Amino acid sequence: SRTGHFYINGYRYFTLGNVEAVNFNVTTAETTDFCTVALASYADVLVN
Amino acid sequence: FMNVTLDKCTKYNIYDVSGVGVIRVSNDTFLNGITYTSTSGNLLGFKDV
């Protein structure tokens, strides 16, 4: 997050002070490398 | 280090939550999170990192 909160599998390990930009250094030989790396914003919803 | 007596009455501090009781191994995937608490507020089970 922009605030710097860091979450792995839901729980938050620690929060960084701030992040201007994020760069992801992940290298996968597999052509079907991964499904998604996206941006998003807060909202109010319900869940089951 | 992670001392963990298994099957006796003990004190405990797990992730900043304290108490007393006995620990039982279980078989449940539950990879969603790291701590599980009852409606009352008393923790029921935890997963090793």
Ligand SMILES: *[C@@H]1O[C@H](CO)[C@@H](O)[C@H](O)[C@H]1NC(C)=O
């Ligand atoms: C998940 O990865 C597999 C790997 O081959 C790919 O075929 C599939 O399209 C992916 N599914 C997604 C991104 O929903």
Ligand SMILES: *[C@@H]1O[C@H](CO)[C@@H](O)[C@H](O)[C@H]1NC(C)=O
């Ligand atoms: C924790 O485990 C180690 C290894 O047996 C032991 O030396 C140490 O005394 C234990 N600590 C307590 C508080 O029992």
Ligand SMILES: *[C@@H]1O[C@H](CO)[C@@H](O)[C@H](O)[C@H]1NC(C)=O
């Ligand atoms: C695993 O868990 C289920 C339900 O929690 C239980 O019925 C079963 O006896 C446990 N052990 C094995 C070997 O499946």
